[PDB]
Amino acid sequence: MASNNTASIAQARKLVEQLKMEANIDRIKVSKAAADLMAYCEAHAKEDPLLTPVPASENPFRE
Amino acid sequence: SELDQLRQEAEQLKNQIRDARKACADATLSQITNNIDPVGRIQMRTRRTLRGHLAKIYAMHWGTDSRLLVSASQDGKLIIWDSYTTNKVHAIPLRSSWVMTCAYAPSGNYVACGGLDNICSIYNLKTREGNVRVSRELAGHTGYLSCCRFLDDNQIVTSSGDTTCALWDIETGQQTTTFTGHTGDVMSLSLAPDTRLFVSGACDASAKLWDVREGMCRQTFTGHESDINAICFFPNGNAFATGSDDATCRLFDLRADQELMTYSHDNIICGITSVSFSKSGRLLLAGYDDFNCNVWDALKADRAGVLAGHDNRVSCLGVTDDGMAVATGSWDSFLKIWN
Amino acid sequence: GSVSKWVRLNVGGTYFLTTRQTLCRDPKSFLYRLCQADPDLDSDKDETGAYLIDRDPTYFGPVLNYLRHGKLVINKDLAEEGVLEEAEFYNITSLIKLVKDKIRERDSKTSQVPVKHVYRVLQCQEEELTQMVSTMSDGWKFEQLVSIGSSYNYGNEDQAEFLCVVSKELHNTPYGTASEPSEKAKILQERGSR
Amino acid sequence: GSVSKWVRLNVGGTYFLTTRQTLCRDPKSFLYRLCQADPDLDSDKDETGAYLIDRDPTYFGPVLNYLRHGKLVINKDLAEEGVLEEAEFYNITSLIKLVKDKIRERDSKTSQVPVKHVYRVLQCQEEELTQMVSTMSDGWKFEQLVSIGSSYNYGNEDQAEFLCVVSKELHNTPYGTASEPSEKAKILQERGSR
Amino acid sequence: ILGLEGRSVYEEDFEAPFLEMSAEFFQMESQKFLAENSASVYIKKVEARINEEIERVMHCLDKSTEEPIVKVVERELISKHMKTIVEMENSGLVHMLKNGKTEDLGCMYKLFSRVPNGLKTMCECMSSYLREQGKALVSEEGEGKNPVDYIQGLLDLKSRFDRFLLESFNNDRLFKQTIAGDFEYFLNLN
């Protein structure tokens, strides 16, 4: 509806909904989320071969 | 009138969201915990240069098989490579040139491409005939097909032009559901390993995480300062790395529901044109509008290494699903298999 | 007297009995507006209760074909342009779309007389050559193969050894010889140009 | 409508006067209703009384001829695709197969209109080159020869002497019946892909 | 529609004049009603007229016009002549709670629930009522008072006042807070 600036109020309703779910969605502090990411990354560091030397036949790109 | 009142209401809602994030905002433990083992500088050498292209490479996408990359050149050419031997499994001319996006399906045999054609071209790699006969030509798009990613064998997301990031049923060639709400064009998409939540990065600098199982948005990450080039989910899908035409990368966490941590860079100022995660997701590889790209630590926010050896900008990145290497859809017409 | 569930319409000299539903392909169409009586209409054939409108039935042919059948197929001997003129007079954007698609199909079919024809270039190695010509995409015709010098790996068997050139009669444009541009596409084209 | 041994159909406003018996060939087609003079299909016209069918007379021709004398004759000035659509409307499977065969013959003959077109490359040196150029198959058309760098001497009498790209205008089969893969075929395709 | 892209015509020609004259009509009607009516009569008549005005405005006004009109309605009727309706002669919260008429208490509360000003004024009112009841209870009544009615009689007073509150002014956090505060206040009087 144009005379309401092309129903820009629908964006307001969507933002109401966005606040609703963002509040419903739990808020995880930055420090502990970072801790979880450290745990996953360091636990996966050895199997990330980018972090490790690769022999001339281990990769399928020197085969 | 009261339209301005509803706009105010939206403003105060965003203010509340900012307040909730700020309360959720804590000290980033990863950067202060910089006593983690140093990332150093990884001297990175490509074992296989993919000179099969002779035009610029705009998009590229490894497959679920994690051996075939579908690097698309804007001249209307798809090169389904053999990354392990530098052989062209397929070389497909495209009905229209200036293709900017190419994705490889969970089928492992379907490939998608989007140009200025406004028609999403899905090519069946394997048929009874043995040649790459096109599977489907999904029309109905309004703007240019800014980015495309395969949801399923018959479901796909096409962040098209005209603020469109709709879902499409490949078999019917029609939209499955309509995803809309952005005021800017949608040109960035990201695939979570969940494969059920896609964060679309539009030109209004709004990383809207949409849920594919509903016809409505899930989260709306912001903090961007320019249109979002590429978005890469973590190998857990718990957070995504975001790059826009700014001099800093960003990392938005869904559990925090806020920008978890930003990768400030003043040693390089070129816009972040592509973002990626390593096998662990510890290494965040950033493609840059200059020839040489980089890889920074997602933990200590420092450069793990430099992707050097290029002669023109890299327009897309793709890491091995085994983490053996990364292919760089550069503009020097060679994809460099950086092992 | 002149209107029923069906309606008699005098396109050209001939009179077709067609349902009021079938004649309308969008409520902006002039035909639908003519289906119900209007105070503006003065000249009509009240001899048989059929409204008089002045257009050729030959280009009404494909129009009514699409309206009744839901799919537009314009005969290879009849002007798709005449169908488009019929649609534009009757103000049916759907028919505008199909005539557009048919005209693209015809321009593919007439891609010998001047109208855009897609051409593409592919690289191939000596070994890959047989595969990618053999696995060359359906709907494309091979046009040329050129041998080149080998900058790597001796003089033959090079990843850049042969340039294949293929083509497609259908043009790459979204429609005909002119498509409505977009500004961001030009922005990115300038970005890639330099 | 009016009772007669024949029946007058208003096919697109055009009166088809055809006998009722030739329309009893396919009850599984819409026509066999239109032939009922009893109240199974009742249709009239406020000018003649003809029954009304909202199907085109454009592609009604070949289908009606197939009903009359058992064989379709698609006029080579009308779209065989339109005849296939008309066959679909009366969903005569034999007629569907016949029009699809006509479209396949078209696509083989019009392989340069973007439809199926098969290509290959032979490898030969001059001695065998003359032989297999001379003994080229009927249907396969030579499209290009090319030399390949010869490590022996500088030119001829090397096994790697000439590639011979040849082509054939191949029929495109309307989809839904062709190009249907198989599981073990895909297993072997994956085996041979590497 | 003549607003075209903005609300300018709709906002200007009638929206604001309707709002302002609506405030004035509400003011004068509420003044006349308070002059002419007791507590319950004022409640019934003002609520009936509020429903009438809202009915007409929904028919004649847009959705976006609701936010101002509701505030004006709650401000000019149920926010200015309110403090009188709390307590008078022959009526009032303290007078009426002893009369045991639950239905009027409910309405006196549900009408007042739209404005937090009315709710807090009632909270003060029956807080004073409960404090008076507790102070009368802790002192001996008649010829002596049993410890059942004095120390643990606070519990009986709390239970009966909880019944009153739940049946008249429903379960609301502010009312529970004030009744618990009163219960703790004369708890020291045992």
Side-chain angles (χ1 to χ4, degrees), chain C residues 77-123:
Chain C
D77 54 18
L78 199 55
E80 314 191 346
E81 297 167 63
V83 191
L84 185 61
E85 282 311 284
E86 200 76 78
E88 285 172 317
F89 174 35
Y90 297 144
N91 193 250
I92 300 161
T93 47
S94 299
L95 270 164
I96 307 302
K97 197 31 247 14
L98 345 154
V99 186
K100 268 160 63 178
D101 185 21
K102 296 310 295 195
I103 283 169
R104 296 193 300 181
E105 283 213 291
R106 179 180 57 71
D107 289 12
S108 174
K109 293 183 300 179
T110 60
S111 202
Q112 307 82 7
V113 304
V115 47
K116 191 168 300 193
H117 192 305
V118 181
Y119 293 83
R120 295 274 180 283
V121 176
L122 318 158
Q123 191 62 272

Short mmCIF file of all heavy atoms in Angstrom, two decimals, chain C residues 77-123:
data_model
loop_
_atom_site.label_atom_id
_atom_site.label_comp_id
_atom_site.label_asym_id
_atom_site.label_seq_id
_atom_site.Cartn_x
_atom_site.Cartn_y
_atom_site.Cartn_z
N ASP C 77 4.82 -20.67 -40.59
CA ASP C 77 4.50 -19.84 -41.74
C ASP C 77 3.79 -18.54 -41.38
O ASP C 77 3.64 -17.68 -42.24
CB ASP C 77 3.62 -20.63 -42.73
CG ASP C 77 2.38 -21.22 -42.07
OD1 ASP C 77 2.00 -20.78 -40.97
OD2 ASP C 77 1.78 -22.15 -42.66
N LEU C 78 3.38 -18.38 -40.12
CA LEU C 78 2.67 -17.20 -39.68
C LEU C 78 3.59 -16.34 -38.82
O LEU C 78 4.46 -16.85 -38.11
CB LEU C 78 1.41 -17.56 -38.88
CG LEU C 78 0.37 -16.44 -38.76
CD1 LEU C 78 -0.02 -15.91 -40.13
CD2 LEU C 78 -0.85 -16.92 -38.00
N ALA C 79 3.39 -15.03 -38.91
CA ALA C 79 4.24 -14.08 -38.19
C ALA C 79 3.97 -14.18 -36.70
O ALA C 79 2.88 -13.85 -36.23
CB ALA C 79 3.99 -12.67 -38.70
N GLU C 80 4.97 -14.64 -35.95
CA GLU C 80 4.95 -14.48 -34.50
C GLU C 80 4.82 -13.01 -34.13
O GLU C 80 4.27 -12.68 -33.07
CB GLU C 80 6.21 -15.07 -33.90
CG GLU C 80 6.57 -16.44 -34.46
CD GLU C 80 7.67 -17.09 -33.67
OE1 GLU C 80 8.30 -16.38 -32.88
OE2 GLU C 80 7.89 -18.31 -33.83
N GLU C 81 5.33 -12.13 -34.99
CA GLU C 81 5.18 -10.70 -34.79
C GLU C 81 3.72 -10.28 -34.87
O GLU C 81 3.27 -9.40 -34.13
CB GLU C 81 6.03 -9.95 -35.81
CG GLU C 81 7.51 -10.24 -35.67
CD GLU C 81 8.31 -9.78 -36.87
OE1 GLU C 81 8.35 -8.56 -37.13
OE2 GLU C 81 8.91 -10.64 -37.55
N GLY C 82 2.96 -10.88 -35.79
CA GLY C 82 1.53 -10.62 -35.83
C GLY C 82 0.83 -11.06 -34.57
O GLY C 82 -0.08 -10.39 -34.07
N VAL C 83 1.24 -12.21 -34.03
CA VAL C 83 0.72 -12.66 -32.74
C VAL C 83 1.05 -11.66 -31.65
O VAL C 83 0.22 -11.37 -30.78
CB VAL C 83 1.27 -14.06 -32.42
CG1 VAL C 83 0.53 -14.67 -31.24
CG2 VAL C 83 1.18 -14.96 -33.64
N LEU C 84 2.28 -11.14 -31.66
CA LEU C 84 2.66 -10.16 -30.65
C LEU C 84 1.84 -8.88 -30.78
O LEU C 84 1.47 -8.28 -29.77
CB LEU C 84 4.15 -9.84 -30.77
CG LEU C 84 4.72 -8.93 -29.69
CD1 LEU C 84 4.57 -9.57 -28.31
CD2 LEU C 84 6.18 -8.63 -29.97
N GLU C 85 1.58 -8.45 -32.01
CA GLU C 85 0.74 -7.27 -32.22
C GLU C 85 -0.67 -7.51 -31.71
O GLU C 85 -1.27 -6.63 -31.07
CB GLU C 85 0.71 -6.91 -33.71
CG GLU C 85 1.95 -6.20 -34.19
CD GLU C 85 2.35 -5.05 -33.29
OE1 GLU C 85 1.69 -3.99 -33.36
OE2 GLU C 85 3.32 -5.20 -32.53
N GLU C 86 -1.22 -8.70 -31.98
CA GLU C 86 -2.53 -9.05 -31.46
C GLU C 86 -2.54 -9.00 -29.94
O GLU C 86 -3.46 -8.42 -29.33
CB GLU C 86 -2.91 -10.45 -31.95
CG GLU C 86 -4.38 -10.77 -31.92
CD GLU C 86 -5.15 -10.09 -33.03
OE1 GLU C 86 -5.08 -10.58 -34.18
OE2 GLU C 86 -5.82 -9.08 -32.76
N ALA C 87 -1.51 -9.57 -29.31
CA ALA C 87 -1.43 -9.58 -27.85
C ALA C 87 -1.31 -8.17 -27.28
O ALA C 87 -1.96 -7.83 -26.29
CB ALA C 87 -0.24 -10.44 -27.41
N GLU C 88 -0.47 -7.34 -27.90
CA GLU C 88 -0.26 -5.99 -27.40
C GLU C 88 -1.51 -5.13 -27.56
O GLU C 88 -1.78 -4.29 -26.69
CB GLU C 88 0.92 -5.34 -28.12
CG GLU C 88 2.27 -5.87 -27.66
CD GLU C 88 3.42 -5.37 -28.50
OE1 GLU C 88 3.28 -5.35 -29.74
OE2 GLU C 88 4.46 -5.01 -27.92
N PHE C 89 -2.26 -5.32 -28.64
CA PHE C 89 -3.55 -4.65 -28.72
C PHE C 89 -4.48 -5.14 -27.63
O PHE C 89 -5.14 -4.35 -26.95
CB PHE C 89 -4.19 -4.87 -30.09
CG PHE C 89 -5.58 -4.32 -30.21
CD1 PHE C 89 -5.94 -3.15 -29.56
CD2 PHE C 89 -6.55 -5.00 -30.91
CE1 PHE C 89 -7.22 -2.65 -29.65
CE2 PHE C 89 -7.84 -4.51 -31.01
CZ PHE C 89 -8.17 -3.33 -30.38
N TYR C 90 -4.54 -6.46 -27.42
CA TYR C 90 -5.41 -7.03 -26.41
C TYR C 90 -4.82 -6.95 -25.01
O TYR C 90 -5.50 -7.33 -24.05
CB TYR C 90 -5.76 -8.48 -26.75
CG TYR C 90 -6.54 -8.60 -28.03
CD1 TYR C 90 -6.34 -9.68 -28.89
CD2 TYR C 90 -7.50 -7.66 -28.37
CE1 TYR C 90 -7.06 -9.80 -30.06
CE2 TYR C 90 -8.23 -7.78 -29.54
CZ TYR C 90 -8.00 -8.85 -30.38
OH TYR C 90 -8.73 -8.96 -31.55
N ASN C 91 -3.58 -6.49 -24.88
CA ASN C 91 -2.99 -6.17 -23.58
C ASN C 91 -2.94 -7.40 -22.67
O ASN C 91 -3.52 -7.43 -21.58
CB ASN C 91 -3.76 -5.02 -22.91
CG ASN C 91 -3.03 -4.44 -21.72
OD1 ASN C 91 -3.46 -4.61 -20.58
ND2 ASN C 91 -1.93 -3.75 -21.98
N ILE C 92 -2.24 -8.43 -23.13
CA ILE C 92 -2.06 -9.66 -22.37
C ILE C 92 -0.57 -9.88 -22.16
O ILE C 92 0.13 -10.35 -23.07
CB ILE C 92 -2.72 -10.85 -23.07
CG1 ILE C 92 -4.22 -10.60 -23.23
CG2 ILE C 92 -2.48 -12.12 -22.28
CD1 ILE C 92 -4.89 -11.46 -24.27
N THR C 93 -0.08 -9.57 -20.96
CA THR C 93 1.34 -9.71 -20.67
C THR C 93 1.79 -11.16 -20.77
O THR C 93 2.94 -11.42 -21.15
CB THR C 93 1.65 -9.18 -19.27
OG1 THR C 93 0.69 -9.68 -18.34
CG2 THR C 93 1.61 -7.66 -19.26
N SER C 94 0.92 -12.11 -20.42
CA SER C 94 1.25 -13.52 -20.58
C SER C 94 1.57 -13.83 -22.03
O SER C 94 2.63 -14.39 -22.34
CB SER C 94 0.10 -14.40 -20.09
OG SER C 94 -0.17 -14.17 -18.72
N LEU C 95 0.69 -13.42 -22.95
CA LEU C 95 0.96 -13.59 -24.37
C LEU C 95 2.20 -12.84 -24.79
O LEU C 95 2.93 -13.31 -25.66
CB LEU C 95 -0.23 -13.14 -25.21
CG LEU C 95 -1.27 -14.21 -25.52
CD1 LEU C 95 -2.56 -13.58 -26.01
CD2 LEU C 95 -0.71 -15.16 -26.56
N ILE C 96 2.47 -11.67 -24.19
CA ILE C 96 3.73 -11.00 -24.47
C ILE C 96 4.89 -11.93 -24.15
O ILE C 96 5.82 -12.08 -24.94
CB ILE C 96 3.83 -9.68 -23.69
CG1 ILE C 96 2.60 -8.82 -23.95
CG2 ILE C 96 5.11 -8.94 -24.06
CD1 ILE C 96 2.39 -8.49 -25.39
N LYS C 97 4.79 -12.61 -23.00
CA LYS C 97 5.88 -13.53 -22.61
C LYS C 97 6.04 -14.61 -23.68
O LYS C 97 7.15 -14.74 -24.23
CB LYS C 97 5.58 -14.17 -21.25
CG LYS C 97 6.78 -14.82 -20.58
CD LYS C 97 8.09 -14.13 -20.92
CE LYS C 97 9.03 -14.98 -21.74
NZ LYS C 97 8.34 -16.16 -22.32
N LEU C 98 4.97 -15.34 -23.99
CA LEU C 98 5.09 -16.49 -24.93
C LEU C 98 5.60 -16.00 -26.29
O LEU C 98 6.60 -16.56 -26.78
CB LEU C 98 3.73 -17.16 -25.07
CG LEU C 98 2.70 -16.78 -24.02
CD1 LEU C 98 1.29 -16.95 -24.56
CD2 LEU C 98 2.89 -17.60 -22.75
N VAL C 99 4.94 -15.00 -26.88
CA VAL C 99 5.44 -14.46 -28.17
C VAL C 99 6.93 -14.14 -27.99
O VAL C 99 7.70 -14.40 -28.94
CB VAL C 99 4.65 -13.24 -28.65
CG1 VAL C 99 5.11 -12.81 -30.03
CG2 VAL C 99 3.15 -13.51 -28.65
N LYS C 100 7.33 -13.64 -26.82
CA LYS C 100 8.76 -13.39 -26.64
C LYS C 100 9.55 -14.69 -26.73
O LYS C 100 10.58 -14.76 -27.41
CB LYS C 100 8.99 -12.72 -25.29
CG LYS C 100 8.99 -11.21 -25.31
CD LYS C 100 8.73 -10.67 -23.92
CE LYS C 100 9.85 -11.06 -22.96
NZ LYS C 100 9.64 -10.50 -21.60
N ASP C 101 9.08 -15.72 -26.03
CA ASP C 101 9.78 -17.00 -26.05
C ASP C 101 9.77 -17.62 -27.44
O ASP C 101 10.78 -18.16 -27.90
CB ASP C 101 9.14 -17.95 -25.03
CG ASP C 101 9.89 -19.26 -24.91
OD1 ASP C 101 11.08 -19.31 -25.29
OD2 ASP C 101 9.29 -20.25 -24.44
N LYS C 102 8.63 -17.54 -28.13
CA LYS C 102 8.55 -18.03 -29.50
C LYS C 102 9.47 -17.25 -30.43
O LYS C 102 10.05 -17.84 -31.34
CB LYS C 102 7.11 -17.95 -30.02
CG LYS C 102 6.14 -18.84 -29.28
CD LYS C 102 6.67 -20.26 -29.19
CE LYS C 102 6.78 -20.89 -30.57
NZ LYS C 102 6.95 -22.36 -30.50
N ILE C 103 9.58 -15.94 -30.23
CA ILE C 103 10.46 -15.14 -31.06
C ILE C 103 11.92 -15.48 -30.78
O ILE C 103 12.74 -15.49 -31.70
CB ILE C 103 10.15 -13.64 -30.85
CG1 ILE C 103 8.87 -13.28 -31.60
CG2 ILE C 103 11.32 -12.77 -31.30
CD1 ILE C 103 8.32 -11.92 -31.26
N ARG C 104 12.26 -15.77 -29.53
CA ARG C 104 13.59 -16.28 -29.23
C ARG C 104 13.83 -17.61 -29.92
O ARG C 104 14.91 -17.85 -30.48
CB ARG C 104 13.78 -16.43 -27.72
CG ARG C 104 13.71 -15.13 -26.96
CD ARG C 104 14.21 -15.30 -25.54
NE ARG C 104 13.42 -16.28 -24.81
CZ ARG C 104 13.64 -16.62 -23.54
NH1 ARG C 104 14.61 -16.07 -22.84
NH2 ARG C 104 12.84 -17.52 -22.97
N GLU C 105 12.83 -18.50 -29.89
CA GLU C 105 12.95 -19.78 -30.57
C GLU C 105 13.14 -19.60 -32.07
O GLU C 105 13.94 -20.30 -32.69
CB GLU C 105 11.72 -20.63 -30.28
CG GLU C 105 11.71 -21.27 -28.91
CD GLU C 105 11.02 -22.62 -28.90
OE1 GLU C 105 9.79 -22.66 -29.08
OE2 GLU C 105 11.72 -23.64 -28.70
N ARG C 106 12.38 -18.67 -32.66
CA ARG C 106 12.49 -18.38 -34.08
C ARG C 106 13.84 -17.76 -34.42
O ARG C 106 14.43 -18.08 -35.45
CB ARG C 106 11.34 -17.46 -34.49
CG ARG C 106 11.35 -17.05 -35.94
CD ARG C 106 10.17 -16.14 -36.22
NE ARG C 106 10.18 -14.97 -35.35
CZ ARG C 106 11.04 -13.96 -35.45
NH1 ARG C 106 11.99 -13.94 -36.37
NH2 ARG C 106 10.94 -12.95 -34.59
N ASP C 107 14.32 -16.86 -33.56
CA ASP C 107 15.62 -16.24 -33.77
C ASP C 107 16.73 -17.28 -33.69
O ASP C 107 17.75 -17.18 -34.38
CB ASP C 107 15.84 -15.13 -32.76
CG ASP C 107 14.96 -13.93 -33.02
OD1 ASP C 107 14.03 -14.05 -33.85
OD2 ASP C 107 15.19 -12.87 -32.40
N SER C 108 16.56 -18.27 -32.81
CA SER C 108 17.41 -19.46 -32.86
C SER C 108 17.25 -20.18 -34.19
O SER C 108 18.24 -20.57 -34.82
CB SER C 108 17.06 -20.40 -31.71
OG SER C 108 17.77 -21.62 -31.83
N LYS C 109 16.01 -20.34 -34.64
CA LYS C 109 15.74 -20.98 -35.93
C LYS C 109 16.13 -20.08 -37.09
O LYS C 109 16.50 -20.59 -38.15
CB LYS C 109 14.26 -21.36 -36.02
CG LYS C 109 13.84 -22.45 -35.04
CD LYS C 109 12.38 -22.84 -35.23
CE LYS C 109 11.46 -21.66 -35.02
NZ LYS C 109 10.02 -22.01 -35.21
N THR C 110 16.05 -18.76 -36.92
CA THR C 110 16.53 -17.83 -37.92
C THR C 110 17.90 -17.27 -37.59
O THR C 110 18.27 -16.21 -38.09
CB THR C 110 15.53 -16.68 -38.11
OG1 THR C 110 15.36 -15.98 -36.87
CG2 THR C 110 14.18 -17.21 -38.57
N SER C 111 18.69 -17.99 -36.78
CA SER C 111 20.03 -17.55 -36.42
C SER C 111 21.02 -17.66 -37.57
O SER C 111 22.23 -17.67 -37.34
CB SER C 111 20.55 -18.34 -35.22
OG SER C 111 21.57 -17.64 -34.54
N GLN C 112 20.51 -17.80 -38.79
CA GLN C 112 21.33 -17.72 -40.00
C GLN C 112 21.26 -16.34 -40.63
O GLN C 112 22.30 -15.76 -40.96
CB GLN C 112 20.88 -18.78 -41.01
CG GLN C 112 20.83 -20.19 -40.45
CD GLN C 112 19.56 -20.48 -39.68
OE1 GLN C 112 18.64 -19.66 -39.66
NE2 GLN C 112 19.50 -21.64 -39.03
N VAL C 113 20.05 -15.80 -40.80
CA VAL C 113 19.88 -14.39 -41.12
C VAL C 113 20.31 -13.61 -39.88
O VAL C 113 20.27 -14.17 -38.78
CB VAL C 113 18.44 -14.07 -41.55
CG1 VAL C 113 18.02 -14.95 -42.71
CG2 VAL C 113 17.49 -14.23 -40.37
N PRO C 114 20.75 -12.36 -40.01
CA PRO C 114 21.31 -11.65 -38.86
C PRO C 114 20.38 -11.64 -37.66
O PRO C 114 19.33 -10.98 -37.65
CB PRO C 114 21.53 -10.23 -39.40
CG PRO C 114 21.83 -10.45 -40.84
CD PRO C 114 20.96 -11.60 -41.26
N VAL C 115 20.78 -12.39 -36.64
CA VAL C 115 20.23 -12.34 -35.28
C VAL C 115 21.22 -13.13 -34.44
O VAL C 115 21.85 -14.07 -34.94
CB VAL C 115 18.80 -12.90 -35.19
CG1 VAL C 115 18.69 -14.22 -35.90
CG2 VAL C 115 18.36 -13.02 -33.74
N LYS C 116 21.37 -12.76 -33.17
CA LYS C 116 22.54 -13.19 -32.40
C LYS C 116 22.64 -14.71 -32.33
O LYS C 116 21.65 -15.42 -32.19
CB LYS C 116 22.49 -12.61 -30.99
CG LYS C 116 23.78 -12.80 -30.21
CD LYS C 116 23.78 -11.97 -28.94
CE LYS C 116 23.64 -10.48 -29.25
NZ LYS C 116 23.94 -9.62 -28.08
N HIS C 117 23.88 -15.19 -32.46
CA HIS C 117 24.21 -16.60 -32.45
C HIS C 117 25.35 -16.79 -31.45
O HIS C 117 26.36 -16.08 -31.53
CB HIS C 117 24.62 -17.05 -33.85
CG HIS C 117 24.71 -18.53 -34.02
ND1 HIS C 117 25.48 -19.33 -33.21
CD2 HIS C 117 24.11 -19.36 -34.91
CE1 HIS C 117 25.37 -20.59 -33.59
NE2 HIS C 117 24.54 -20.64 -34.62
N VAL C 118 25.18 -17.71 -30.52
CA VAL C 118 26.17 -17.89 -29.46
C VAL C 118 27.35 -18.68 -29.99
O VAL C 118 27.19 -19.67 -30.70
CB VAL C 118 25.54 -18.58 -28.24
CG1 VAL C 118 26.57 -18.73 -27.14
CG2 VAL C 118 24.39 -17.76 -27.73
N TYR C 119 28.55 -18.24 -29.63
CA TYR C 119 29.78 -18.94 -29.96
C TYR C 119 30.65 -19.01 -28.72
O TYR C 119 30.69 -18.07 -27.93
CB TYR C 119 30.52 -18.23 -31.09
CG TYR C 119 29.77 -18.28 -32.40
CD1 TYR C 119 28.77 -17.37 -32.67
CD2 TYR C 119 30.04 -19.26 -33.33
CE1 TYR C 119 28.07 -17.42 -33.85
CE2 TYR C 119 29.34 -19.32 -34.51
CZ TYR C 119 28.35 -18.40 -34.77
OH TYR C 119 27.65 -18.45 -35.94
N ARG C 120 31.33 -20.14 -28.53
CA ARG C 120 32.12 -20.36 -27.33
C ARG C 120 33.40 -21.08 -27.69
O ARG C 120 33.48 -21.80 -28.69
CB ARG C 120 31.34 -21.16 -26.29
CG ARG C 120 30.12 -20.47 -25.74
CD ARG C 120 30.49 -19.56 -24.59
NE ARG C 120 29.32 -18.88 -24.05
CZ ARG C 120 28.73 -17.84 -24.62
NH1 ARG C 120 29.19 -17.32 -25.75
NH2 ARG C 120 27.65 -17.31 -24.06
N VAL C 121 34.41 -20.89 -26.85
CA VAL C 121 35.73 -21.46 -27.03
C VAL C 121 36.06 -22.31 -25.82
O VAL C 121 35.85 -21.89 -24.68
CB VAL C 121 36.80 -20.38 -27.24
CG1 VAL C 121 38.18 -21.00 -27.33
CG2 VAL C 121 36.48 -19.57 -28.48
N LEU C 122 36.59 -23.50 -26.06
CA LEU C 122 37.01 -24.42 -25.03
C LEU C 122 38.44 -24.85 -25.28
O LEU C 122 38.90 -24.95 -26.42
CB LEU C 122 36.09 -25.65 -24.99
CG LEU C 122 34.60 -25.34 -25.15
CD1 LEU C 122 33.86 -26.57 -25.65
CD2 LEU C 122 34.01 -24.86 -23.84
N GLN C 123 39.16 -25.11 -24.20
CA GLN C 123 40.48 -25.70 -24.26
C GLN C 123 40.36 -27.21 -24.16
O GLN C 123 39.39 -27.73 -23.59
CB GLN C 123 41.37 -25.18 -23.13
CG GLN C 123 42.84 -25.54 -23.25
CD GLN C 123 43.48 -24.97 -24.48
OE1 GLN C 123 43.45 -25.59 -25.55
NE2 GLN C 123 44.06 -23.79 -24.36
#
